[PDB]
Amino acid sequence: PDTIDRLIADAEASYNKWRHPDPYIVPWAPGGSKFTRNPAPPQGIEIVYDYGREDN
Amino acid sequence: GGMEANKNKFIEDWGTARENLEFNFRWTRRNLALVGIFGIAIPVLVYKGIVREFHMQDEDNGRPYRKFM
Amino acid sequence: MYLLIVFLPLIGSSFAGFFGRFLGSEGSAIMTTTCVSFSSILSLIAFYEVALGASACYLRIAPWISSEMFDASWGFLFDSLTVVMLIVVTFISSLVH
Amino acid sequence: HLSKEEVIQRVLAVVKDFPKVDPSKVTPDVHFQKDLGLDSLDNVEIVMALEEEFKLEIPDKEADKIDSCNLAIEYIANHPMA
Amino acid sequence: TTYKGVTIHQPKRWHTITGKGLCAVMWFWVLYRAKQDGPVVLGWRHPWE
Amino acid sequence: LMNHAFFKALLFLSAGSVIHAMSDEQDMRKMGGLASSFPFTYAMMLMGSLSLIGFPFLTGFYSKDVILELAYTKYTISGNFAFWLGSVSVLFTSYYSFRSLFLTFLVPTNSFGRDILRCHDAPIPMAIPLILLALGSLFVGYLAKDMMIGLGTNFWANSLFVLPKNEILAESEFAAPTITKLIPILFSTSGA
Amino acid sequence: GRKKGYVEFDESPPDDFDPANPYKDPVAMLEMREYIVREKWIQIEKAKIIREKLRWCYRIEGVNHLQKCRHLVNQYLESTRGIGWGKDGRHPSLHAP
Amino acid sequence: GSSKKMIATQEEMVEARVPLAYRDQCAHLLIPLNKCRQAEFYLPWKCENERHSYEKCEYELVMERMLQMQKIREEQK
Amino acid sequence: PSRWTSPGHEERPKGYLFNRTPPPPGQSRKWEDWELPCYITSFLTIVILGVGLNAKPDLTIETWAHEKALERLKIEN
Amino acid sequence: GDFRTKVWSMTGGPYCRPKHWKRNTAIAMFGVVLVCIPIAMKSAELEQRPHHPVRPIPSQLWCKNFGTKDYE
Amino acid sequence: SGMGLPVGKHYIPDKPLPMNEELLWDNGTPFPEPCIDRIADTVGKYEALAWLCGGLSFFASLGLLAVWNDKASKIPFTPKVYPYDNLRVELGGEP
């Protein structure tokens, strides 16, 4: 397992050296062109009416 | 209504540490160099440049160079 | 005509941004597009008049920044170059709308 | 949204279109290592092919977690961008 | 039409007609202008010839 | 500037039509084989790209070629620098425009099957601007040549001022050798 | 209350003002300062009038504006010689007599 | 200099509003061409005779300058 | 169901202005104490500013010096 | 959305389709026509054309400041 | 154009924050990136600086080559001379 781990580390370094500068990303995937374009509204959000009044 | 932010202990600690930076000053080498460069040398250079601009204007006008503090 | 050229996009933009709840997604689009289209038509007429008629239109409304000789103003210089840019901007804006 | 039956059919097509796989013994509830006999690298190749067909991107951890047909169908059906 | 399991609908008739006609107009304009101003561009003869 | 406005707006509108139809793909590595499925949009892209390259007697042929001729005829260090970089930029522009055309439309399909099924060409209000921009990218360069870039035109009146010692338009037109006039076309076809 | 809305000032330096000792009389000092301000403003407005007629010369005359408005250019540039109060950054070739 | 006398005068060049950079010996032929261009909306197929004459005059001027510089270079060598 | 023909779904713009709960039908909302003085002083500010600034004589030193400069230029010329 | 229907925004909001958008757009057209009249009259009053045009032009119908300016 | 997926839950800090967390341009999304992002993560900052300096040096070398060319010394036409004293009065000379 030790030489397996060193092989894994060397392969990871080699991959980090030769990886594509701008790898393809699905547009809606994290980091794509469509990421967080028109997201659905978050749940559990409340709008309060008559916030500031002179008398309650 | 119940609009108060859900305060995070670590965020509040970060804010307090940021606003209490005065206790961490120690006159280290980096702090001394930064004070001597950006607190003295840069203002002195700016003042000298401004006085030089005024004196160049005086020379171009032919007047006698003005007196500054 | 020329202040209409300059301010027609502004009128449509202001009305659609202050009363967009009543115009809607289709009404606001129609309004902005027709304002820009009329601006482009008036720009073509101005091109005829100025560039093809060898004329030149000058306008001035208010001094804006008025100092001893800081002679700012709300003027409008309508030369052949200005009119060519007017056509380019207005036509592209209408097509993009 | 895309129907679960169509998800099952497309995943089964991806699995069946494999060299080291016998197309007869492919069922929505088979395991890559156990039933139809593939190693880890064939599993990740199949996951990549599923991504390419379905137009979706899986994080590496979940891609490793996908190790069987049933998991593949479950994940693809739960994904809203299938 | 479908070939293996994927069917692709034909592009709309007005799409095809518009694209083909506009490209044909482009190519005919290029050819006509080349015939008219060929020697002038290529230096064979001046415009006043 | 006017010619570039026309054909560049055309290119952007056509690319936006392609992107909108392809479910906001925007990446050329997954866009191959759309010439058949996008007849009108591909036609518009081809017209605009040829204009941008400066295919003879389009709207880009009447603008960039004269710029290159003037850069050559400006016998100065800056003129030589500009001429060299302009010629090489014409070569590179032809290369990347034709590469974009090939990758987006003519290269065999590399996109996912999900986008290929649901692809529809530009609707009427996305096609009316494209047709007008194509007509402009065809005839604006030819119609406005004598109006704007002509020899001693009083069209500009006093809007644009050029010193008598700085006018080299006629010098370029009647002095530039034929090979230097034809350099942009050769570089464009080599880049293609 | 004011009588009518038009300014009434005197176009003459205030009397009992000593140039040798301008600070002897405070009223004379302040009135002389006001008069100097008024004279400088008059010169500024004269330069502004010359500038306006120069700009309209440049607009009316087209390509041949360099020789038709040369006199106006020279007049304006000599008129802007001593306009300012603190324009010492302007080069003496254009701001010094 | 040049081998062509300047037919157009300063007064008529100013009246016609000929551009400054083109107030050369061919301005007398440019003046009718600019009037034609104004009359025909600067269309590139309307004023042909005047445009051809003006371009021929400009080409003659440029060829005169080329001959002068060639003579200068031959004298230098 | 064309977008240019079918009427819109919502009868009222979403939400309420100033996040104010609408009064029950047949009733008018009760004004705040500050509202009347604030609106009266706003209207008074508008009318006072407009009327006074438009009716104020143009007795500026700039216009006075412009008139004097015009007189001096006419005298000199 | 679920909570966006309770948020009042000047420019409609997400998916703003009022029931009477046609009538509102007609009223907006009329408002543009009304507001453009003073602007057009001010344009016709303030335009200055020192050069008489070569051809008759539409601006000659209302604008009268044609050739009435001199630099003296 | 069209509604997308929900962004998801952001990061609630559970460990003491760094003293420069304002240099973390975090949205309401679980994928924050610093306000200053290096587009080419593969190359180091100094390597990128060296490559950019090489490109600018190529531009400067091409400019020096243009200077060494002396194209103005090989002009084929004599400078144009205008009539009426080289348009002195028209350009603004003293009449």
Q: Do K15 and B13 touch (CB under 8 A)?
A: no
Rounded-to-integer distance, Cα K37 and Cα K24, Å: 10
Query: Residue C83's CB: how many other CB atoms inside 10 A?
Result: 24
Q: Which residues of I touch J (CB under 8 A)?
A: 7-11, 13-19
Give the dihedral sign, CA G9/G11/G16/G18: positive
Closest Cβ–Cβ partner in F37, F131, F178 for E42: F178
Please name the chains neighbouring D, where neighbouring means 3+ C-beta pairs under 8 angstroms.
Answer: A, F
Assess I16–A contact: CB distance below 8 Å, yes or no. Answer: yes
Contacts of D79 in chain A (CB under 8 A): none
DSSP state for residue C64 in the 8-state scheme: S
The three-state secondary structure class of F21 is helix
Question: DSSP of F46-102, one letter per residue?
Answer: HHHHHHHHT-TTSTTTTTHHHHHHHHHHS-SHHHHHHHHHHHHHHHHHHHHHHHHHI
Q: Which residue has the tokens 């190749």?
A: D45
The answer to whether chain I touches chain G by having 3 or more C-beta pairs less than 8 angstroms apart is: yes
Contacts of J51 in chain G (CB under 8 A): 60, 62
Which pairs with CB-CB distance under 8 Å and at least 24 residues apart come from G4-10? G4/I57, G5/I56, G5/I57, G5/I58, G5/I59, G6/I57, G6/I59, G7/I59, G7/I61, G7/I63, G7/I64, G9/G38, G9/I64, G10/G35
Contact partners, residue E25, CB within 8 Å, separation at least 6: F138
Contact partners, residue A15, CB within 8 Å, separation at least 6: none
For residue G62, what is the nearest residue in chain F, using CA coordinates?
F158
For residue G50, what is the nearest residue in chain I, using CA coordinates?
I73
Helix-helix angle F77-101:F178-191, to 10 degrees? 30
Q: In 3D, which of F37, F182, F12, F184 has the Cα closest to residue F100? A: F12
Size of interface A-B (CB pairs under 8 A): 4
Rounded-to-integer distance, Cα B68 and Cα A18, Å: 62
CA dihedral H40, H45, H47, H49 (to 10 degrees): -170
Rounded-to-integer distance, Cα I69 and Cα B22, Å: 62
Per the structure block, which two tokens stand in for F65?
Answer: 């070629």
Contacts of A45 in chain J (CB under 8 A): 2-3
Q: Is D17 known to be catalytic?
A: no
Question: DSSP of I28-45, one letter per residue?
Answer: -PPPPTTHHHHHHHHHHH
Q: Which residues of E20-42 are buried (b: 16+ CB within 10 A; e: fewer)?
A: eebbeebeeebeebeeeeeeebe
Q: Do H20 and G62 touch (CB under 8 A)?
A: no
Query: Residue C59's CB: how many other CB atoms inside 10 A?
Result: 18
Q: Which residue has the tokens 């010439």?
A: F35
Contacts of K79 in chain F (CB under 8 A): 165
Q: Do K6 and A40 touch (CB under 8 A)?
A: yes
Rounded-to-integer distance, Cα D60 and Cα D79, Å: 15
CB E33 within 8 Å of CB F142: yes
Per the structure block, which two tokens stand in for F165?
Answer: 């010692």
Rounded-to-integer distance, Cα A24 and Cα B55, Å: 60
CA dihedral H15, H21, H23, H25 (to 10 degrees): -160
Give the dihedral sign, CA F15/F21/F27/F31: negative
Burial class (CB in 10 A: 0-12, 13-18, 19+), D46: buried
Question: Chain centroid to CA J49: how far?
Answer: 22
For residue G38, what is the nearest residue in chain I, using CA coordinates?
I65
Interface of D with A in 27-66 (CB under 8 A): 55-57
Rounded-to-integer distance, Cα H55 and Cα H70, Å: 22
Please name the chains neighbouring J, where neighbouring means 3+ C-beta pairs under 8 angstroms.
Answer: A, C, G, I
Question: What are the start-end ranges of the E strands in C1-97?
Answer: 57-59, 76-78
Contacts of I62 in chain C (CB under 8 A): 66
Q: Rg of chain D over CA atoms, in angstroms?
A: 12
Residue type, J48: Q
Residue type, K32: P
CB F36 within 8 Å of CB F121: no
Q: Do I13 and C21 touch (CB under 8 A)?
A: yes
Per the structure block, which two tokens stand in for F177?
Answer: 């050798």
Size of interface F-G (CB pairs under 8 A): 7
Give the dihedral sign, CA F152/F155/F157/F159: negative
Assess G66–H contact: CB distance below 8 Å, yes or no. Answer: yes
Q: Do K19 and B11 touch (CB under 8 A)?
A: no
Assess F129–C contact: CB distance below 8 Å, yes or no. Answer: yes
Q: Do I21 and A50 touch (CB under 8 A)?
A: yes
Contacts of A28 in chain D (CB under 8 A): 81
Assess C54–F contact: CB distance below 8 Å, yes or no. Answer: yes
Rounded-to-integer distance, Cα D48 and Cα D41, Å: 10
Q: Which residues of C touch I (CB under 8 A)?
A: 21-22, 24-26, 66
Give the residue ranges of DSSP H helices in C1-97: 2-18, 20-47, 80-96
- Element containing residue H32 per DSSP (H, E): helix H27-39
How far does J5 lie from chain C, in Å, by closest CA?
12
Per the structure block, which two tokens stand in for I39?
Answer: 């609106």
How far does I58 lie from chain A, in Å, by closest CA?
46
Q: Do A36 and K7 touch (CB under 8 A)?
A: yes
Rounded-to-integer distance, Cα J29 and Cα C16, Å: 11
Catalytic residue of the set D17, D22, D39, D64: D39
CA atoms within 13 A on the CB side of I18: 7
Q: In 3D, which of J63, C95, G65, C55 has the Cα closest to residue F16? A: C95
Assess H66–K contact: CB distance below 8 Å, yes or no. Answer: yes
Q: In 3D, which of K43, K79, H7 has the Cα closest to residue F167? A: K79
Rounded-to-integer distance, Cα I75 and Cα I69, Å: 10
Rounded-to-integer distance, Cα J51 and Cα J28, Å: 38
DSSP state for residue G38 in the 8-state scheme: H
What phi and psi, each to the nearest 5 degrees, are found at residue K4? -115, -170
Q: Which residues of G touch J (CB under 8 A)?
A: 53-54, 56-57, 59-60, 62, 69, 72
Contacts of D52 in chain F (CB under 8 A): 112
Contacts of I69 in chain G (CB under 8 A): 42-43, 45-46, 48-49
Closest Cβ–Cβ partner in C56, C58, C69 for G44: C69
DSSP state for residue F28 in the 8-state scheme: G
CA atoms within 13 A on the CB side of F131: 16
Rounded-to-integer distance, Cα G86 and Cα C85, Å: 39
Bridge partner list, J48: C58
Per the structure block, which two tokens stand in for G48?
Answer: 């502004």
Give the residue ranges of DSSP H helices in K3-93: 45-69, 83-91
Q: Which residue has the tokens 């009518």?
A: G4
Give the angle subtended at the CA of D61 by the CAs of D59 and D64, to the nearest 5°: 110
Per the structure block, which two tokens stand in for H52?
Answer: 């051809």
Contacts of H38 in chain C (CB under 8 A): 54
Please name the chains neighbouring B, where neighbouring means 3+ C-beta pairs under 8 angstroms.
Answer: A, G, K
Assess F158–E contact: CB distance below 8 Å, yes or no. Answer: no
Contacts of F1 in chain C (CB under 8 A): 88
Q: Do F41 and E19 touch (CB under 8 A)?
A: yes
Please name the chains neighbouring E, where neighbouring means 3+ C-beta pairs under 8 angstroms.
Answer: F, H
Assess G65–F contact: CB distance below 8 Å, yes or no. Answer: yes
Rounded-to-integer distance, Cα K59 and Cα F45, Å: 33
Interface test with I, best of C19, C21, C25 (most I CBs within 10 A): C21
